[PDB]
C-alpha cells in the first residue's frame, strides 16, 4: 500500500486491532525497531478508545459518591483495579467528579457487574 | 487478517517512508518530542 | 504502589484504558519520555484484545467464502478496511481460512453491520 | 480516573524501577527489543 493508505487503514483500525498490530510488530521486528510505530499508533488507539466511549461500543463506571461507607467503596475499587490505598483512595475521593471513573472501555455488561458491586459497598455508581 | 495486510505493507516500506508514515501520524495527533509544558 | 502493584494494576486495564493511558502519557511527557511505557504496554493491550475476543466481549467478522463475485467482495473489504487493492485481494482470497478476519475488536451490531455488507457483496461470513 | 491514578504512580518511579517495570512487562509478554 501507499503511505496514505496505510494511514487510512490504520485510522480505521479498532483499538484492539491497533494494539495487536503493534504487539505483532514488536514480536516481528523487536521492540526497538518497532517502537516507532508503537508510539505513532498510540495516539490513534487512544483517539479510537475515546470514540468508542463517545458512542456506545464501550462504557465506563463513574463513582458518584462513596457515602457513609467510603472505606469499603475503596476496598472494592482496589479489588477491581489493582490500585493501592493512596491511589484507590485519591480516586474514590473524586466521587461526584467526572475524573471519578473507576473503569472504562468495557461492555455494558461488566458496567453493571462492577457498578452493582460498587453499590454493594454502598456507593453511587453512574454508567456512561 | 487485516492487520497482517497492513503489517506486510509496513514491512515493505523503506526506512524513509516509514519515517513519512510516522510523521503523518504524529503531525495529525499533535504528538511532540518533549513534554509541551514543564513537568519540572 | 510497588512495581508489581503497578504491573498488576496495568494487567487489569482494558485495551482502551491502555490506549488512553499511553496516549495521555505521550501528550503530557512527549513521545521520547513516553516511549518506554508505550512499547511495554503494547503487548499488554494485545493480550487484552485477545481476551476480549475470546470472551464474546468484542467480536470479529470472518470470511467463510468470497462468493460468486470475488471482485465485489474485495471492493467492500477495501471500503471497510482502507486496505490497498492487492492486500484486500490477498485477504479476501483467504476466505474459508481462520485468519481471513476482515475486522475485529468491534461491537456486536457493528459486527453484524459489517457482516451484512459483505453478504450484500455475495460473501459468506461468520461472527465470533 | 484509574489510568490517571496509574500514570501518577509510574510518574514517580525514579528512572530505575521504571526501567524495572519496563523489563518486567517485556519479559512477561515476550521481551523483544531485538527480534
B14 CA: distance to closest CA in chain C (Å): 17
Question: Which fold does the domain D1-30 belong to in CATH?
Answer: 1.20.5
Pick the residue from chain C with its C-alpha nearest to A31.
C39
- Here the cell at position A78 is 482496589
Residues near C97 by beta carbon (within 8 Å), at least 6 away in sequence? none
Pick the residue from chain C with its C-alpha nearest to D21.
C3
- The two beta strands, C124-127 and C59-65, are antiparallel
B11 touches chain A (CB under 8 A): yes
The resolution, in Å, is 2.4
D6 touches chain C (CB under 8 A): yes
Method: X-ray
Closest CB from D2, D4, D34 relative to A30: D34
The β-bridge partners of C101 are C62
- Same-domain status, C66 and C44: no
Residue C111 near residue C79 (C-beta atoms within 8 A): no
End-to-end CA distance of chain D: 35
- Same-domain status, A50 and A77: no
The β-bridge partners of C59 are C106
Residues of B in contact with A47 (CB under 8 A): 29
- Here the cell at position A25 is 510488530
Distance CA A78, CA C4 (A): 14
* Buried/exposed A52-66: b ≥16 CB within 10 Å, e otherwise: bbeeebbbbbbbebb
Residues of A in contact with C17 (CB under 8 A): 49, 103-105
Q: How many CB atoms lie within 10 A of CB C77?
A: 30
* Furthest C-alpha separation in chain D: 35
- Same-domain status, C24 and C75: no
Count structural domains, chain A: 2
Burial group, residue D24, by CB count within 10 angstroms (0-12, 13-18, 19+): middle
Q: Do B2 and C30 touch (CB under 8 A)?
A: no
CA-based nearest residue to A37, from A60, A13, A68? A13
C88 touches chain A (CB under 8 A): no
- Same-domain status, A102 and A128: yes
- Contact partners for chain B, using 3 or more CB pairs closer than 8 A, are A, C
- Same-domain status, A45 and A77: no
DSSP per residue, C43-107 = HHHHHHHHHHHTTTSSEEEEEEE--S-HHHHHHHHHHHH---HHHHHHHHTTTTSTT-EEEEEE-
Residues of B in contact with C25 (CB under 8 A): none
Domain of A86, CATH number, reads: 3.30.1390.10
Determine the structural domain holding residue A121 and report its residue range: 58-128
- Same-domain status, A7 and A64: no
- The two beta strands, C124-127 and A124-127, are unpaired
Distance CA A27, CA A12 (A): 22
C103 touches chain B (CB under 8 A): yes
C54 CA: distance to closest CA in chain D (Å): 18
Closest CB from C8, C9, C81 relative to A12: C81
- Here the cell at position A69 is 461507607
Q: How many CB atoms lie within 10 A of CB B34?
A: 11
Distance CA B25, CA B23 (A): 5
- Same-domain status, C48 and C77: no
Residues of C in contact with A27 (CB under 8 A): 43
D15 touches chain A (CB under 8 A): no
- Same-domain status, C52 and C63: no
Looking at C57, C80, C103, the residue that finishes a domain is C57
Classify the phi-psi angles of C56: left when phi > 0, otherwise alpha if psi is within -120 to 50, otherwise beta. Answer: left
Domain of C26, CATH number, reads: 1.20.5.710
Torsion of CA C67, C70, C71, C75, to 10 degrees: 70
- Same-domain status, A80 and A29: no
Distance CA C14, CA A15 (A): 10
Instruction: Give, to the nearest 10 degrees, the angle between helix A70-81 and helix A85-92.
Output: 120
- Same-domain status, C68 and C116: yes
> 3-class DSSP state for residue C31?
helix
C8 touches chain A (CB under 8 A): yes
Amino acid at each position: 500500500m501507499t503511505i496514505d493508505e496505510i494511514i487510512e487503514a490504520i485510522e480505521k483500525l479498532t483499538v484492539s486491532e491497533l494494539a495487536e498490530l503493534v504487539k505483532k510488530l514488536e514480536d516481528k521486528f523487536g521492540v526497538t525497531a518497532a517502537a516507532p510505530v508503537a508510539v505513532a499508533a498510540a495516539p490513534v488507539a487512544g483517539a479510537a478508545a475515546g470514540a468508542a466511549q463517545e458512542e456506545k461500543t464501550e462504557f465506563d463506571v463513574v463513582l458518584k459518591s462513596f457515602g457513609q461507607n467510603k472505606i469499603q467503596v475503596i476496598k472494592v475499587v482496589r479489588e477491581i483495579t489493582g490500585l493501592g490505598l493512596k491511589e484507590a483512595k485519591d480516586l474514590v475521593e473524586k466521587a461526584g467528579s467526572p475524573d471519578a471513573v473507576i473503569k472504562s472501555g468495557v461492555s455494558k455488561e461488566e458496567a453493571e457487574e462492577i457498578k452493582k458491586k460498587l453499590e454493594e459497598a454502598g456507593a453511587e455508581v453512574e454508567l456512561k | 487478517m487485516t492487520i497482517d495486510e497492513i503489517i506486510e505493507a509496513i514491512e515493505k516500506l523503506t526506512v524513509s517512508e516509514l519515517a513519512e508514515l510516522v510523521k503523518k501520524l504524529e503531525d495529525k495527533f499533535g504528538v511532540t518530542a518533549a513534554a509541551p509544558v514543564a513537568v519540572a
